[PDB]
Design a protein around this ligand. Structure first.
Ligand SMILES: [Cu+2]
Length: 124
C-alpha cells in the first residue's frame, strides 16, 4: 500500500510540518513525501530507525517515494527545518521493538515535542 505525506510551510499543527506527522504502515508499504511547498526534504533522524533499516536523505524539493520494510518506529526530519520541529514518525507494524531506543535519541526541543506527540498518536 502507498501513502502520501505533504511537506508544508504551515498546517494545522503550525509552522514547517509534515502532514500527517504520524503514520502506521505495514512492512513493504511506501510513503511518498510530496513537495507541496518548496524548500523541504525528508531524512532519517539518527538513532530513530530500527535494526534492518537504512538511513536516507532526499534532495530539497524532491518528490520522494520510500519503501519501509523493517518493523519499528522511524523518526524523520526535514533537514533545513529540523531545528524548528519539522519532523514525523512512520511506524511499521504493531508493538514496535525499538520504542525505548528511539525515545532516548537526542533532538532539539520543538522536534522532540512533535516526535513525542507523533509517538503518542501512534499508540505508544
Ligand atoms: Cu522543511
Amino acid at each position: 500500500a502507498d501513502f502520501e505525506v505533504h511537506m508544508l510551510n504551515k498546517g494545522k499543527d503550525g509552522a514547517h510540518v509534515f502532514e500527517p506527522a504520524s503514520l502506521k504502515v505495514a512492512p513493504g508499504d511506501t510513503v511518498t513525501f510530496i513537495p507541496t511547498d518548496k524548500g523541504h526534504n525528508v531524512e532519517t533522524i539518527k538513532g530513530m530507525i530500527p535494526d534492518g533499516a537504512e538511513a536516507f536523505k532526499s534532495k530539497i524539493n524532491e518528490n520522494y517515494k520510500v519503501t519501509f520494510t523493517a518493523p519499528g518506529v522511524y523518526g524523520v526530519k526535514c533537514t533545513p527545518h529540523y531545528g524548528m520541529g519539522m519532523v514525523g514518525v512512520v511506524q511499521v507494524g504493531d508493538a514496535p521493538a525499538n520504542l525505548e531506543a528511539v525515545k532516548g535519541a537526542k533532538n532539539p526541543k520543538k522536534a522532540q515535542e512533535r516526535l513525542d506527540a507523533a509517538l503518542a498518536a501512534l499508540g505508544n
